[PDB]
């Protein structure tokens, strides 16, 4: 009943933790800000500083003042939040009596639309809304402290007794990402677009040795700094979120199981005549159709549908299917990345024919770039699989065995072979170096090439993905594959990768 005073707590914002990039480039920093606030019965007692007030904060003035008198009976309120600690002492500086200043912080990303879909960015209340701002939310936002103080009834701030909690700090924390990488990556997959006409794409590069992603761009792209425009759509993770049936691309699992059975090897020839291949009601069609023989290499080089649907019949459908799903495809990242998608890997107790040839050419299977990048990492890393990461790796995780050494090496032999030989994939080629990659057309249609480098002894997988290329040649090749090799051979460069095509040593 009308209590003289009252004891009152408030929390301490507390400093959210560095995002940096793995060599300690600054992509998220926890920049000094003032939010303003004030005591309505203060204000009720100056009533002649209001206008002055209001047009310090930017408001109107009868506006300001309607809002002061109907939060009269009320306490406590907000002026404005945010604003630069010299405008916060600008405010001040007018001494209206009410009005109260605290300290704050606010994001600010240096690198800005480079690194927006990775970096994601926090909310009003700095705390974590997309990407690693949210992923890692925890360890970047630390704890907020509070302040024990005193108010009387109608809450003048009278005094403060002590601080109840020291706020803590929040982390530090270091990204896989390479913003050297990054840049180039960004730079070439927008000036692609561009000219190609393409409403978007996305382009992932990984360490195949440490799982490590070392750039993840998507197109478009947005400025996190400056959120006004609100766009929805531009704001899409689509290397982790947009979801596809790879084609083409997955053909290297397929041959790699049937390397495996011990049915098969590169030399072996298989009759993909007429182009077409009938089984029971739905018919199997290679896109081109003017083959007859064809080696193992022949069938990717061609994408023949037909060639690795009957060498699928042989082998059967499990061993690729186990293949598929342990170098991840539609299988859950562990990145716990916000609106990460896991697409989808059918399984069947009895696979009958046509869901075992879709499966081998890479239809009725949907995953992401983030998923396909990795298998490709898995196989450019002899066989081996190592957990997806988009923190620093310093210590290498034990990683599974998913493809043995040698159908690793011929694999990766025949994908060179892909990149090289006549009839193939030749400007995905790299300047100094042999590369390794396959191409594809996506249905979400994309132009899609997933490849790594060097091919004889790798150290970077990249998927390449272009959406709706606008132009006379619309196919998996010709859009995608000048992409991969200008983003691989800088990325070999700055990460100073020997060339392994020299004249032959």
Same mark, same amino acid.
């Given at each position: 009943?009308?209590?003289? #005073?009252?004891?009152?707590?408030?929390?301490?914002?507390?400093? #959210?933790?560095?995002?940096?990039? !793995?060599?300690?480039?600054?992509?998220?920093?926890?920049?000094?800000?003032?939010?303003?606030?004030?005591?309505?019965?203060?204000?009720?007692?100056?009533?002649? #500083?209001?206008?002055?007030?209001?047009?310090?904060?930017?408001?109107?003035?009868?506006?300001?003042?309607?809002?002061?008198?109907?939060?009269?009976?009320?306490?406590?309120?907000?002026?404005?939040?945010?604003?630069?600690?010299?405008?916060?002492?600008?405010?001040?500086?007018?001494?209206?009596?009410?009005?109260?200043?605290?300290?704050?912080?606010?994001?600010?990303?240096?690198?800005?639309?480079?690194?927006?879909?990775?970096?994601?960015?926090?909310?009003?209340?700095?705390?974590?809304?997309?990407?690693?701002?949210?992923?890692?939310?925890?360890?970047?936002?630390?704890?907020?402290?509070?302040?024990?103080?005193?108010?009387?009834?109608?809450?003048?701030?009278?005094?403060?007794?002590?601080?109840?909690?020291?706020?803590?700090?929040?982390?530090?924390?270091?990204?896989?990402?390479?913003?050297?990488?990054?840049?180039?990556?960004?730079?070439?997959?927008? *000036?692609?677009?561009?000219? *190609?006409?393409?409403?978007?794409?996305?382009?992932?590069?990984?360490?195949?040795?440490?799982?490590?992603?070392?750039?993840?761009?998507?197109?478009?792209?947005?400025?996190? *700094? *400056?959120?006004?425009?609100?766009?929805?759509?531009?704001?899409?993770?689509?290397?982790?979120?947009?979801?596809?049936?790879?084609?083409?691309?997955?053909?290297?699992?397929?041959?790699?199981?049937?390397?495996?059975?011990?049915?098969?090897?590169?030399?072996?020839?298989?009759?993909?005549?007429?182009?077409?291949?009938?089984?029971?009601?739905?018919?199997?069609?290679?896109?081109?159709?003017?083959?007859?023989?064809?080696?193992?290499?022949?069938?990717?080089?061609?994408?023949?549908?037909?060639?690795?649907?009957?060498?699928?019949?042989?082998?059967?459908?499990?061993?690729?299917?186990?293949?598929?799903?342990?170098?991840?495809?539609?299988?859950?990242?562990?990145?716990?990345?916000?609106?990460?998608?896991?697409?989808?890997?059918?399984?069947? !107790?009895?696979?009958?024919?046509?869901?075992?040839?879709?499966?081998?050419?890479?239809?009725?299977?949907?995953?992401?770039?983030?998923?396909?990048?990795?298998?490709?990492?898995?196989?450019?890393?002899?066989?081996?699989?190592?957990?997806?990461?988009?923190? !620093?790796?310093?210590?290498?995780?034990?990683?599974?065995?998913?493809?043995?050494?040698?159908?690793?090496?011929?694999?990766?032999?025949?994908?060179?072979?892909?990149?090289?030989?006549?009839?193939?994939?030749?400007?995905?080629?790299?300047?100094?170096?042999?590369?390794?990659?396959?191409?594809?057309?996506?249905?979400?249609?994309?132009?899609?090439?997933?490849?790594?480098?060097?091919?004889?002894?790798?150290?970077?997988?990249?998927?390449?993905?272009?959406?709706?290329?606008?132009?006379?040649?619309?196919?998996?090749?010709?859009?995608?594959?000048?992409?991969?090799?200008?983003?691989?051979?800088?990325?070999? #460069?700055?990460?100073?990768?020997?060339?392994?095509?020299?004249?032959?040593?």
């Amino acid at each position: 009943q009308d209590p003289a #005073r009252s004891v009152r707590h408030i929390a301490i914002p507390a400093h #959210r933790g560095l995002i940096t990039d !793995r060599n300690g480039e600054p992509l998220a920093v926890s920049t000094p800000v003032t939010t303003l606030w004030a005591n309505p019965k203060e204000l009720m007692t100056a009533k002649e #500083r209001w206008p002055q007030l209001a047009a310090a904060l930017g408001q109107d003035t009868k506006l300001f003042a309607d809002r002061i008198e109907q939060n009269a009976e009320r306490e406590f309120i907000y002026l404005v939040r945010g604003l630069t600690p010299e405008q916060g002492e600008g405010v001040i500086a007018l001494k209206v009596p009410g009005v109260y200043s605290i300290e704050e912080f606010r994001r600010f990303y240096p690198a800005g639309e480079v690194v927006a879909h990775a970096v994601g960015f926090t909310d009003v209340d700095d705390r974590g809304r997309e990407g690693i701002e949210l992923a890692f939310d925890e360890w970047l936002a630390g704890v907020p402290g509070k302040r024990q103080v005193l108010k009387d009834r109608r809450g003048r701030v009278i005094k403060d007794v002590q601080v109840t909690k020291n706020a803590k700090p929040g982390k530090t924390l270091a990204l896989s990402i390479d913003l050297r990488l990054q840049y180039l990556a960004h730079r070439e997959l927008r *000036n692609a677009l561009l000219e *190609n006409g393409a409403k978007a794409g996305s382009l992932v590069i990984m360490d195949v040795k440490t799982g490590e992603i070392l750039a993840m761009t998507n197109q478009p792209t947005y400025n996190p *700094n *400056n959120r006004r425009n609100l766009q929805p759509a531009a704001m899409r993770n689509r290397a982790m979120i947009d979801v596809f049936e790879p084609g083409s691309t997955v053909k290297p699992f397929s041959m790699s199981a049937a390397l495996a059975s011990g049915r098969w090897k590169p030399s072996d020839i298989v009759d993909v005549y007429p182009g077409t291949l009938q089984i029971g009601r739905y018919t199997i069609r290679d896109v081109s159709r003017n083959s007859r023989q064809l080696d193992l290499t022949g069938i990717l080089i061609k994408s023949s549908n037909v060639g690795i649907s009957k060498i699928a019949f042989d082998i059967g459908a499990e061993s690729i299917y186990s293949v598929m799903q342990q170098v991840g495809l539609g299988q859950d990242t562990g990145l716990g990345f916000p609106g990460e998608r896991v697409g989808n890997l059918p399984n069947h !107790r009895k696979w009958p024919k046509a869901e075992t040839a879709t499966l081998a050419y890479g239809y009725g299977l949907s995953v992401t770039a983030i998923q396909l990048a990795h298998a490709y990492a898995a196989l450019a890393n002899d066989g081996k699989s190592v957990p997806l990461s988009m923190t !620093r790796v310093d210590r290498v995780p034990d990683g599974v065995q998913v493809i043995s050494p040698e159908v690793a090496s011929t694999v990766q032999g025949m994908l060179q072979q892909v990149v090289e030989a006549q009839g193939g994939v030749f400007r995905a080629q790299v300047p100094g170096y042999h590369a390794a990659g396959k191409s594809g057309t996506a249905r979400k249609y994309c132009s899609l090439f997933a490849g790594f480098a060097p091919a004889t002894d790798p150290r970077i997988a990249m998927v390449v993905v272009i959406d709706e290329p606008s132009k006379a040649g619309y196919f998996g090749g010709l859009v995608s594959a000048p992409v991969f090799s200008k983003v691989m051979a800088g990325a070999l #460069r700055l990460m100073n990768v020997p060339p392994d095509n020299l004249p032959t040593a």
